[PDB]
């Protein structure tokens, strides 16, 4: 449900 | 000097995120806006010196400083991330600031836009007279 994420 | 005083102030942190009809040239799929405000349009500038939004290192000039309201950043991007937010106070002593790790999350295309609200309470025990009067104008 969320997009991908950065870190 | 027997009397003592605890002052609470409410902060609202939040963000909106929506898929762009047309992605940007860089491939940014979302427009988003993150903010810090008082509830019910109250005026936190009485005690807030500035709000610093620390954007992901992939953003240019990632330390975004808002010395004046609205305390917000509007950007475009492709992915969510942890966004540290510091609220600095019109304070001469401790605490000079408070920090929140804000989860700037985005929803995939095909889901409703993000409209997220995060309430936080701040407590100041026996603030200085000057700070107390600033806090209580908000």
Numbering used by the authors:
A (entry chain B): 4 to 10
B (entry chain A): 1 to 138
Reproduce the article's own wording on this structure.
One of the major and widespread PTMs is acylation of the ε-amino group of lysine residues. Canonical acyllysine readers, bromodomain and double PHD finger (DPF), display comparable binding capabilities toward various short acyl chain modifications, and while the YEATS domain exhibits preference for crotonyllysine, it still associates albeit more weakly with other acyllysine marks. In this study, we elucidate the significance of π stacking components in targeting of acetyllysines by the YEATS domains and report a previously uncharacterized DNA-binding activity of the human AF9-YEATS domain. Collectively, our results have illuminated the mechanistic basis underlying distinct recognition of acyllysine PTMs by the YEATS domains of yeast Taf14 and human AF9, allowing us to develop a Taf14-YEATS module that selects for the crotonyl modification and discriminates against saturated acyl modifications.
